[PDB]
Amino acid sequence: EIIPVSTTLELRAADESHVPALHQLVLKNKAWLQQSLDWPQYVTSQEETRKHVQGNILLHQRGYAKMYLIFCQNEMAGVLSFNAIEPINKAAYIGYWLDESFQGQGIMSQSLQALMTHYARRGDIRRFVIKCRVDNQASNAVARRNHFTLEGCMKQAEYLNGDYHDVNMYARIIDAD
Amino acid sequence: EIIPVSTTLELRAADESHVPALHQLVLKNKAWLQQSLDWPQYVTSQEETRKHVQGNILLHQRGYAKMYLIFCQNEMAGVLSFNAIEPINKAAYIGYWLDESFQGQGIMSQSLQALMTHYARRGDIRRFVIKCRVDNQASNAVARRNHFTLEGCMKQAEYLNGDYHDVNMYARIIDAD
Ligand SMILES: *SCCNC(=O)CCNC(=O)[C@H](O)C(C)(C)COP(=O)(O)OP(=O)(O)OC[C@H]1O[C@@H](n2cnc3c(N)ncnc32)[C@H](O)[C@H]1OP(=O)(O)O
Ligand SMILES: *SCCNC(=O)CCNC(=O)[C@H](O)C(C)(C)COP(=O)(O)OP(=O)(O)OC[C@H]1O[C@@H](n2cnc3c(N)ncnc32)[C@H](O)[C@H]1OP(=O)(O)O
């Protein structure tokens, strides 16, 4: 399962074969990922990433979540995913991160747009949501460029780096009729 | 486990012994509950309520959710609960409903306040949230009387009664220091 993004980019569904490369990518970025994600601190050994992946693959096959790996000229560059899918509401919560050396190239912006369009077209997701610290300006720029509307500010909603942070909730509705 | 509310009210932790009475209460109110809750339509037989209860009791014991039954002069009057608890964020999502014949007496308002105070005092929950259709004025009045702040409006976020509804997100932070 591959969702095309561009002549140099593609989304591949999470595989057990990706575990090794992804573990290294996580290691290389966890110091800075920790400021806006919670799970990187619990990742130490490859076994823990494999665990996260096998679990994700299941929710992925059942349609309860999705995990895609972003590939740039056959090189793993980051992860784009639906952390949770509420089938009855056709709503999904988005999560993503990019290896620091693949940033600043519009890679995530384009991947998100290709991913959303694909699901709005299939029709099982029409409402997309992005929740992230209010102060993560890079993620906010990805959401706005993808036409997300800020719905609210959740006060001190997430505990990250020994402190509570206000979280913005961005959403976009796409009815691909 | 009983959390006191008033000389005529109390909160009792969900029990297997409550299943029968609760099933009847659900039956008596599901026609109208369906307009703002999704699970009442899946409840037909007592076995299904027992299922919902045994599951809840587990999340309750693990601290991942809570389910309390509201009792009014030893008579079951409704349910008040934390649908989900995010331990790391000390945040909880509230759910509640009252049998139609126990409404209009400030019973839910008082029960919610007693419940929140008890958890903010214990310190494992400091952020309380209420999400419900924007047009449910009775629930909105319970949230405002309990000093919740409206954080945002989630567009067409819930599918209920064959249609999508805008959902308000109310929140309150309590640091019982
Ligand atoms: S809490 C939920 C959010 N997750 C995280 O915060 C995870 C940690 N952060 C990241 O991994 C990272 O900061 C993310 C993926 C959020 C954003 O990274 P980028 O800023 O690299 O995003 P993107 O890959 O979309 O690149 C946009 C930027 O690239 C430049 N640029 C050049 N060319 C383009 C094109 N053609 N299209 C769009 N952008 C392009 C811009 O300088 C950057 O754009 P901004 O305007 O978004 O700053
Ligand atoms: S989607 C998440 C919300 N859940 C649901 O909507 C579930 C379905 N609805 C209900 O079960 C029900 O409508 C709920 C529980 C939301 C609200 O019911 P009540 O309106 O009966 O609330 P409560 O029990 O808090 O009673 C308040 C009302 O009672 C009157 N009243 C008399 N005396 C008092 C006192 N002492 N204190 C407060 N209220 C009191 C008021 O006439 C009603 O108050 P409002 O001002 O809230 O309308």
Side-chain angles (χ1 to χ4, degrees):
Chain A
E1 180 194 2
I2 305 302
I3 292 163
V5 181
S6 83
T7 58
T8 55
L9 296 173
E10 73 184 23
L11 298 192
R12 314 192 182 161
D15 244 19
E16 296 224 50
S17 73
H18 300 126
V19 170
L22 175 59
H23 187 64
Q24 288 313 98
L25 214 64
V26 182
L27 285 193
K28 177 159 154 358
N29 299 276
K30 69 175 283 172
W32 68 271
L33 281 168
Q34 299 182 342
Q35 51 159 198
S36 56
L37 298 203
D38 188 303
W39 64 269
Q41 65 215 5
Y42 302 122
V43 188
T44 292
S45 58
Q46 187 169 111
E47 313 165 81
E48 295 169 326
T49 289
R50 187 175 314 280
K51 231 57 183 45
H52 185 85
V53 177
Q54 294 180 318
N56 277 174
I57 288 171
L58 291 172
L59 297 170
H60 191 111
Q61 294 161 339
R62 302 178 166 41
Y64 270 128
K66 299 293 168 166
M67 180 182 200
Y68 290 89
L69 287 172
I70 305 170
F71 273 89
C72 181
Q73 313 210 235
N74 299 313
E75 184 169 330
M76 202 188 285
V79 179
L80 167 55
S81 74
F82 288 137
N83 289 154
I85 298 178
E86 289 165 9
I88 309 169
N89 307 307
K90 284 174 186 311
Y93 289 93
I94 291 148
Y96 47 59
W97 61 270
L98 262 188
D99 164 77
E100 94 261 274
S101 101
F102 284 87
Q103 293 180 13
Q105 293 169 62
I107 287 178
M108 186 61 66
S109 288
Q110 315 180 65
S111 294
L112 169 66
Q113 184 236 72
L115 176 75
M116 277 188 304
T117 280
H118 176 90
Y119 280 82
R121 285 183 160 171
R122 280 157 57 103
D124 47 6
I125 295 164
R126 69 195 278 295
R127 180 180 152 79
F128 310 82
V129 189
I130 297 174
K131 300 163 64 177
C132 190
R133 283 164 62 146
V134 179
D135 64 1
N136 190 322
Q137 301 164 80
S139 172
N140 293 348
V142 175
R144 291 190 309 269
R145 163 156 39 245
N146 275 276
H147 305 111
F148 278 65
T149 287
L150 176 63
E151 282 179 334
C153 185
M154 297 165 64
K155 291 319 179 85
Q156 300 177 27
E158 293 177 13
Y159 189 66
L160 298 165
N161 285 206
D163 212 359
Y164 296 99
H165 308 269
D166 279 2
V167 169
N168 269 345
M169 172 169 282
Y170 281 102
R172 186 183 180 185
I173 289 173
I174 303 179
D175 285 315
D177 288 316
Chain B
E1 180 194 2
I2 305 302
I3 292 163
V5 181
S6 83
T7 58
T8 55
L9 296 173
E10 73 184 23
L11 298 192
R12 314 192 182 161
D15 244 19
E16 296 224 50
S17 73
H18 300 126
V19 170
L22 175 59
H23 187 64
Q24 288 313 98
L25 214 64
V26 182
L27 285 193
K28 177 159 154 358
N29 299 276
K30 69 175 283 172
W32 68 271
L33 281 168
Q34 299 182 342
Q35 51 159 198
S36 56
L37 298 203
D38 188 303
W39 64 269
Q41 65 215 5
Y42 302 122
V43 188
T44 292
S45 58
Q46 187 169 111
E47 313 165 81
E48 295 169 326
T49 289
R50 187 175 314 280
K51 231 57 183 45
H52 185 85
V53 177
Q54 294 180 318
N56 277 174
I57 288 171
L58 291 172
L59 297 170
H60 191 111
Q61 294 161 339
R62 302 178 166 41
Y64 270 128
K66 299 293 168 166
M67 180 182 200
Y68 290 89
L69 287 172
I70 305 170
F71 273 89
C72 181
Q73 313 210 235
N74 299 313
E75 184 169 330
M76 202 188 285
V79 179
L80 167 55
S81 74
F82 288 137
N83 289 154
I85 298 178
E86 289 165 9
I88 309 169
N89 307 307
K90 284 174 186 311
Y93 289 93
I94 291 148
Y96 47 59
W97 61 270
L98 262 188
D99 164 77
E100 94 261 274
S101 101
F102 284 87
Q103 293 180 13
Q105 293 169 62
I107 287 178
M108 186 61 66
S109 288
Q110 315 180 65
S111 294
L112 169 66
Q113 184 236 72
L115 176 75
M116 277 188 304
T117 280
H118 176 90
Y119 280 82
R121 285 183 160 171
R122 280 157 57 103
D124 47 6
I125 295 164
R126 69 195 278 295
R127 180 180 152 79
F128 310 82
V129 189
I130 297 174
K131 300 163 64 177
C132 190
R133 283 164 62 146
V134 179
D135 64 1
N136 190 322
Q137 301 164 80
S139 172
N140 293 348
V142 175
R144 291 190 309 269
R145 163 156 39 245
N146 275 276
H147 305 111
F148 278 65
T149 287
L150 176 63
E151 282 179 334
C153 185
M154 297 165 64
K155 291 319 179 85
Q156 300 177 27
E158 293 177 13
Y159 189 66
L160 298 165
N161 285 206
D163 212 359
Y164 296 99
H165 308 269
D166 279 2
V167 169
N168 269 345
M169 172 169 282
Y170 281 102
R172 186 183 180 185
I173 289 173
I174 303 179
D175 285 315
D177 288 316

